[PDB]
Amino acid sequence: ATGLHVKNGRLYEANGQEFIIRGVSHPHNWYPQHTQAFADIKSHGANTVRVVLSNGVRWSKNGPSDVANVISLCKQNRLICMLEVHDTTGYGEQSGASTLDQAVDYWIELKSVLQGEEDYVLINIGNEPYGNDSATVAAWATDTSAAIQRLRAAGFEHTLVVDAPNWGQDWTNTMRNNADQVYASDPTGNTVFSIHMYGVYSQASTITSYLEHFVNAGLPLIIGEFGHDNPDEDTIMAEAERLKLGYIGWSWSGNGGGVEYLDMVYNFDGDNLSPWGERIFYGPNGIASTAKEAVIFG
Predict the structure, then answer these.
(1) The domain containing residue 128 runs over which residues?
(2) Is 212 in the active site?
(3) Count of domains in the chain?
């Protein structure tokens, strides 16, 4: 059965209530010991959590039982769970990345724990699945359409979330110009596009133009990741509120590799907010003042 689904370019629960995602990502794969984060994230008002999983290509695979446990943590804490395979990141540029087909192999393997959870879980097929290599960025639309068709053929009814090329930022506007072709390829219409806004989106003009393109065309869109400063997070949040689009900040805690300033809380301590955590949860157009829990939990 279908749970969350798309109607007229927007996201709805099965009872017909519109759902506007207001959440954060949590690096579950890399920090399995920090499962308290699910309740901590809920305590600050988020309605969704984007969970980092691995299909075993680049990190250690999250098996079915582990994924079942993450889904119950989401449900227990009344959060919609967006699961994502992180191994696809930067494919065609990043050495050892997974392809979307390898991500799809993994989702099919979890079929028995995901089927029947369509009201609670969204499947983000693969994070930022192309880097900037021109020849593989040119395959974004065909590869993404192929992955959707495989998932629907395996019986998945969930709403699927697909990321853009150019490491998620789509500065080539490949996702923007071709999302109509990809959307048409899902027989159920339950596909949502996801843009990640970092340094390409430091100007308000670029942010606004990108979001309006999708809203004016009825193409479903969420801001799957964004950071602060240098993207203009003030405009990203204001515009997401004005246009009623979902957004998900990166990330709860535990950033390494130079982006330690993207931690929202220090050392996974839910009461120890950084300035980014205070901006995204408690600032203007922030999670605590704008998010609404999914009505499926009432």
Answers:
(1) 1-298
(2) no
(3) 1
